[PDB]
Amino acid sequence: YAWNRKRISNCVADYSVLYNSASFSTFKCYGVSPTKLNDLCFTNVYADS
Amino acid sequence: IQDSLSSTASALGKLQDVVNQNAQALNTLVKQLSSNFGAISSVLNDILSRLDPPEAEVQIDRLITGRLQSLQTYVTQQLIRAAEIRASANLAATKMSE
Numbered sequence: 001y002a003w004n005r006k007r008i009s010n011c012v013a014d015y016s017v018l019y020n021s022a023s024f025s026t027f028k029c030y031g032v033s034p035t036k037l038n039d040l041c042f043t044n045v046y047a048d049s
Numbered sequence: 050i051q052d053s054l055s056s057t058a059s060a061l062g063k064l065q066d067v068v069n070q071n072a073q074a075l076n077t078l079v080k081q082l083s084s085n086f087g088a089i090s091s092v093l094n095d096i097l098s099r100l101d102p103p104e105a106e107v108q109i110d111r112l113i114t115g116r117l118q119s120l121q122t123y124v125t126q127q128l129i130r131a132a133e134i135r136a137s138a139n140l141a142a143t144k145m146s147e
Binding site for chain 2: 032035040
């Protein structure tokens with residue numbers, strides 16, 4: 001009910017590590033395939049926890 | 050006649066209309082490339098560089114269907130216009146001969 005939103009910008013993100021980390025039980029991506037994340041550039045990334 | 054042609058600008062409206070119609074049809078056909086048609090994006094490279102195979106076939110297919118429809122409409126319009134222009138050209142040939 002009070003989800004915390006974190007801002008991410010001005011950095012390089014190596015999503016390969018996150019995808020390969022087996023600790024993540026559920027890893028679903030809708031607008032983009034998880035594998036392709038390493039060769040894209042975004043205006044900014046929002047993280048909600 | 051020389052003075053009228055040199056002064057008035059609307060004399061050749063018959064030819065100007067043909068030129069404008071063709072240019073406008075081409076402009077519409079080109080602009081049609083910028084429509085999503087329901088896909089996530091209207092850029093094939095962006096679709097391919099974001100989604101993966103099996104997926105992204107839906108997006109490519111939506112774009113294909115939309116663009117194919119646009120091309121078919123353009124070609125049908127061109128065929129009808131060509132028929133009209135051929136009628137005019139046959140009339141002009143008859144006028145020349147007679």
